[PDB]
Design a protein around this ligand. Structure first.
Ligand SMILES: Nc1ncnc2c1ncn2[C@@H]1O[C@H](COP(=O)(O)OP(=O)(O)CP(=O)(O)O)[C@@H](O)[C@H]1O
Ligand SMILES: Nc1ncnc2c1ncn2[C@@H]1O[C@H](COP(=O)(O)OP(=O)(O)CP(=O)(O)O)[C@@H](O)[C@H]1O
Lengths: 731, 731, 141
């Protein structure tokens, strides 16, 4: 009936996408929606800090860091006197539906407010408000929270709006700084945010393959000073021309004593005498522009939040909207606030594995993976099989492939295999471009764009004899492929060729890597976040144009092949007005309908348009056709420009999502390989390791055939199609 | 003969573009060229720190911060014992020509070494070297320096390699931060580099329209504490949701006492009680990737340096290569090293106007312009004319237009005019979209992409009657136009329409703004540095992807109209293999010849290609044609991809060059307007204010007609065409 | 366009399952022969399919048709008669004109007079006789 939305706490990139999603979805469901300026402060002050919102108020906001409606820290809201005055102002305007976008504290605050919402009974016991209105507006205080925080603090949620973006800032800094660690082989201690949370520290570290990291959840344990210094001297012996050490603000040892970045420098300058600087990043990390992931994430939960509020009844407890396993869920607000404090309590009580376990499994996966690729046991202590495992790149280049290779190699070596790097995909395979590869060979790869080993789309079918010859020559006991649809096709071909060539009767696993995200058996592929970010950046600049000129509509063609992932998701994140794709037919009625919408849109103040066309979405309805239609039908009203982005959409260095995705899923694949070799051939030894809903699973290529449209190289059931109605709503 | 190049001192972005330019140009003139690794240290150590360089060695270097060959600080080089050993190693390889890329100290070192050369006579008096070789390799030690430094320290030079890039890092941080300041209404004190130089502080401040700045050249003078605090409270009264204060590392008051950023925070937290943070940026500012300006700059001086060396004779004194007024000059090395110390001596001796005067006029122009737009005299003290001056945007959107508008408005108001903002170019003019605009209305624009007032290409010719009606209605005493060729054409039309419409008999001035840089009467236009960076940014990401297979050529189409500025300069900065432009005809022989070159290039290790096509460089030879030719003729060898960059080249946020160029030239134009109105119509009152070689000048539109190719809307004589031989040399 | 496409669709429920669409080469900037080909192709998808042809420079001809030979012959002779008659009376608008067929009979019209009857920007006249026949095509189809 009336919805109020506010933004409390340390601001986060994506907060604006969320407010936009709540205001638009609220209005779309036919509700009125009120801004509450300056977080809880606006609610305490009242009056004009509360103001109705229309469609136009949330445009030009999406692509912008921080909150276009303010975040106040609000002391007053920690006091009964403040909360009475807040509740009063809400009742003044009939607001009893509340959407609160903030962090641990903001949500602890809203949980407390909700419980206390019979502060109304105080209001009546004074003049405050009418007696009968203590019952009209009673405990139908309907609270829903979304966690907007760069820290990944909150317990319920797998992810928080801001984190991906903050990690972008950190890695932009880290990548920038690595070129100045050559002006002397400098050691840089970088101090990142996460006051009582190590997530942002951990992820950064993993993403830039950092030499050491410090988290409060998981302290170093006694004697690390020497072990770290061994690492950094070993690194000068490996000839590494720098060192990078990532330190959470709230890092501690096993006694809860601060490990400060200035402390670390003194240790390194003292023991080793390396030239050493310390950068305190600070509020950069809250700033800049919201990544495509946060824009989309925030947009999905702005919408679920509005549904959760209207679906709520006086029975339903206050909840927190979350994406767990790429599905939007509601979680009871009380319990999540509780669980988060519990994590502080675990650290406070020197119970560190408990803090880590309570953080979620995700946290522990990052931590475990990081250690494995950062600390190398001496050859003496890693005994193990005389197995030789190969690593190859197949498909077109995808950002993150390199990270992936480095991970596979180190985990294999760590598991005591011997790692063979195969060059140029199945081309180099057929021609025997194979060489042994070690731990140091893959150092500094975690953020390299493209493919250093080299990648080709060519399939193995016509080189089975030659390829089988190479496996025999090099005694290849297993194979890991990092690639796109061509890899998948490659496994099918080799699976079928087993009965003629013994050499292919080994465990073969693939992890998916392409900008296109068209690989069957995985909801995500290494490289697509990078691409979405370049698309998102580009559309932002485009709309800025459309906006200066006014009355202009841009038609923009994107990649994907027949896979409308980049187009669709790119559309959402850029706040386009339409994104045509192959998996959703559209006729000239659909086009005329969008054209008529845009026409009406040019009677408002937002006189711009953004239309995205998947490059292979329609035989006849080409980018030109669409450009010609809209140009012509808008004739009294707007004009158009077509742009074909083409292969620059790939982007450059992989985005952190792709680096870590590359790193994490590849290591998980190698684990599978060693476990299999350890029990020493059927369908179960040739599979795709991919992300399916909640968890990662290995799916035999046999099974994926029936789930695959071979003729357009896209899967048959694609998860992101369920999101199609958002674009149109949120526009 | 033989040339050696080294990189000493605090490293700077663009140092690599310079080494590449020296190696390629050295070889091109048929010299041998040696790397000297690790600055002066490599020269002292000898052996393999000196290594001959071939063509291939300097590829993949251009787009990378810092030095691919090291910078050592070198104590040994401060001692006769070190310099003897250095001189010895040079003679061992016949190196007697030296190119030194560094700063104050590096260059002071090379000047000393030069004077002392015939430390050789010591070499003979020992075993060191043959007696007769003390005369073959004698005082034909030929030294040439280039200044690679982010600080703009050195005196001779107008600009130093690294500054533009560093200012990019700073503004990237400052832009990122503004977002979290809005959110909480925070005051941010940012501490930037410039140990004993205020340039990087000053330019930043101007580029992000900072609320206060602190330079060591120009201290605050007594009573600033209160004056600053008045400013920041006035800013909350204006409802500005943040404050940004830029503090040079080496800021001081009039007594040479440190003004620390932690000191500023205490003053603001104390007197006003605003929420306040401090960011120390640190070595981020030396990092990241070299801007297009530094790439081009460094490339032009790498080349001049090689010429300077071979043209030198034992008479000619060691020099420092510089761009002053966009023309490469040689400056005696001794005198420039002297002058720079003089500036420290001036500050040390509390002689502050002398430090500013010795910094150059450029420095004092930035400082003066900054103050004018940052400090607003109370209405009481700004009396002045009852004149109404209009500001309009004409042409397609260009990054920096907004900065320009803000500057015009404030300088006009400061000059006691009444400022009218005209919306949507001559469209809105004809339709009377005119409104008064004030000081606060333009706050926060300095870094806004696109055009907030709005721009249209439509010309006034068919709306003279209507437009004249608007000037009469609003009593428009003068006009400032920020725009491209359409503005220029617009002034010609209105100039001609004077005799029929009295209303156009006012002073009209235009400042040039377009990504294209095709405006006659100016070597530069507001928006083109942004576009060059977008082009440069994009090629970098392209080269970053596809990595191991290579044998790929990218054909990339750029804007400009018929103006090959973006294409040509973009080509240089991106290190392209060709950039086809309209001002230099090419036939199918030319194309076949480039294709056959690239073919030979794929027999080397650098198997990539980059071809840029100005979008209107040829009717028949389209981007597709070129893509089809190269694709086909490389068939055994390489393959291709075409990309049409399109409307992103306008930009996201304007680059600092464009912001400051926008700000400075617009203010200068408004000055002209007020001076003209003060003497109160012929050709001299309708002109283009533009940058011509060394200095800015107003040129009547009458005079520019003969200097204009009207049919292709480019000027006739274009300064950057003299640079055409570089691309091919440096490739 | 959509209305013609829907007509042809219904037409393919009768026995005359063919279609013929003609496009004047400059009839629309945006609605090109390809656009129309793409629309009809796509919207007929369950029903009919398409082929585009651009006739081009054959439309000039091989040998002229008899109408054109005789028209060429008859009007040119008539123009020469005019020339000799004029030269025989031996300068204003009436000596520079277009000899052309207007309704029933041929007439000489000064170029001065034809300017106001001319769309210069698309090089067609303003009032064109055959446009009165436009309803026939649809009727007779
Ligand atoms: N009892 C409570 N506990 C915590 N926060 C509360 C609260 N009651 C109100 N709040 C609000 O939360 C603000 C505290 O800062 P805060 O902890 O909320 O940041 P945040 O949630 O956005 C990021 P993080 O959760 O990582 O701290 C206060 O200004 C106050 O208005
Ligand atoms: N008088 C001198 N004689 C010999 N070497 C000298 C010298 N002055 C400077 N150098 C060289 O340069 C270094 C010392 O000053 P430095 O080069 O570091 O300043 P700089 O030129 O890099 C940057 P800035 O612009 O801030 O002064 C030493 O490594 C030394 O090799």
């Amino acid at each position: 009936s009336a919805i109020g939305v506010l933004t409390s706490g340390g601001d986060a990139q994506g907060m604006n996408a969320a407010v936009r999603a709540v205001v638009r979805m609220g209005i779309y469901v036919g509700a009125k929606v009120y801004f509450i300026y300056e977080g809880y402060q606006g609610m305490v002050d009242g009056g004009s800090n509360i103001a109705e919102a229309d469609w136009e108020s949330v445009s030009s906001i999406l692509q912008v860091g921080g909150t276009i409606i303010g975040s106040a820290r609000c002391q007053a809201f920690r006091t009964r006197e403040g909360r009475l005055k807040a509740a009063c102002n809400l009742l003044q305007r009939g607001i009893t539906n509340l959407c609160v976008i903030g962090g641990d504290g903001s949500l602890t605050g809203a949980n407390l407010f909700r419980k206390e919402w019979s502060g109304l009974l105080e209001e009546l016991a004074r003049n405050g408000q009418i007696d009968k209105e203590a019952v009209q507006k009673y405990a139908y205080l309907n609270v829903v929270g979304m966690v907007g925080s760069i820290d990944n603090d909150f317990c319920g949620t797998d992810m928080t709006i801001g984190t991906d973006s903050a990690l972008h800032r950190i890695i932009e800094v880290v990548d920038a700084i690595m070129t100045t660690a050559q002006s002397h082989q400098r050691t840089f201690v970088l101090e990142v945010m996460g006051r009582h949370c190590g997530y942002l520290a951990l992820v950064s570290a993993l993403a830039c393959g950092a030499d050491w990291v410090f988290l409060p959840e998981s302290p170093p344990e006694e004697g690390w000073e020497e072990q770290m210094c061994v690492k950094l001297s070993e690194n000068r012996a490996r000839k590494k021309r720098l060192n990078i050490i990532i330190v959470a603000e709230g890092a501690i040892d096993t006694q809860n004593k601060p490990i400060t970045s200035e402390k670390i420098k003194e240790l390194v300058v003292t023991q080793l005498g390396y030239d050493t600087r310390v950068t305190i990043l600070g509020h950069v990390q809250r700033g800049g522009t919201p990544s495509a992931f946060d824009r989309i994430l925030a947009s999905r939960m702005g919408v679920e939040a509005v549904i959760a509020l209207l679906e709520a009844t006086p029975d339903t407890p206050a909840c927190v909207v979350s994406l767990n396993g790429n599905h939007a869920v509601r979680l009871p607000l009380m319990e999540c606030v509780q669980m988060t404090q519990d994590v502080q309590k675990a650290m406070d009580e020197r119970r560190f594995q408990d803090a880590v376990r309570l953080r979620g499994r995700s946290f522990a996966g990052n931590l475990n993976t990081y250690k494995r690729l950062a600390i190398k046991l001496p050859d003496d202590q890693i005994p193990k099989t005389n197995c030789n495992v190969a690593v190859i790149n197949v498909g077109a280049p995808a950002a993150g492939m390199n990270a992936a290779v480095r991970s596979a190699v180190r985990v294999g070596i760590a598991d005591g295999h011997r790692m063979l790097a195969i060059y140029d995909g199945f081309d180099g395979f057929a021609k025997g471009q194979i060489k042994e590869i070690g731990w140091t060979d893959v150092g500094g790869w975690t953020g390299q764009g493209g493919s250093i080993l080299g990648t080709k789309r060519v399939l193995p079918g016509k080189y089975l004899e030659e390829i089988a010859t190479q496996m025999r020559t090099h005694s290849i006991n297993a194979l890991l492929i990092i690639g796109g649809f061509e890899a998948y096709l490659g496994l099918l071909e080799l699976s079928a060729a087993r009965e003629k060539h013994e050499e292919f009767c080994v465990p073969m696993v693939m992890v998916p890597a392409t900008v296109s995200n068209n690989v069957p058996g995985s909801d995500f592929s290494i490289g697509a976040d990078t691409a979405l970010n370049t698309i998102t950046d580009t559309c932002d600049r485009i709309k800025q144009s459309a906006s200066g000129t006014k009355r202009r509509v841009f038609i923009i063609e994107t990649m994907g092949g027949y896979c409308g992932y980049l187009a669709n998701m790119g559309g959402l994140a850029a706040g386009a007005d339409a994104a045509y794709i192959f998996e959703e037919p559209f006729d000239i009625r659909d086009l005329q309908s969008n054209v008529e919408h845009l026409t009406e849109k040019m009677k408002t103040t937002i006189q711009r348009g953004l239309v995205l066309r998947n490059e292979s979405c329609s035989e006849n309805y080409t980018t030109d056709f669409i450009y010609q239609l809209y140009s012509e039908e808008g004739k009294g009203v707007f004009d158009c420009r077509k742009n074909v982005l083409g292969h620059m959409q790939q982007g450059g260095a992989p985005s952190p999502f792709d680096r870590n995705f590359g790193t994490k899923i590849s290591a998980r694949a190698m684990e599978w390989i060693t476990a299999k070799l350890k029990e020493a051939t059927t369908d179960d030894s040739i599979c795709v390791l991919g992300i399916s809903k909640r968890n990662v699973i290995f799916q035999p290529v046999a099974e994926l055939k029936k789930q695959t449209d071979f003729e357009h190289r896209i899967p048959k059931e694609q998860w992101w199609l369920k999101l199609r109605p958002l674009m149109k709503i949120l526009a």
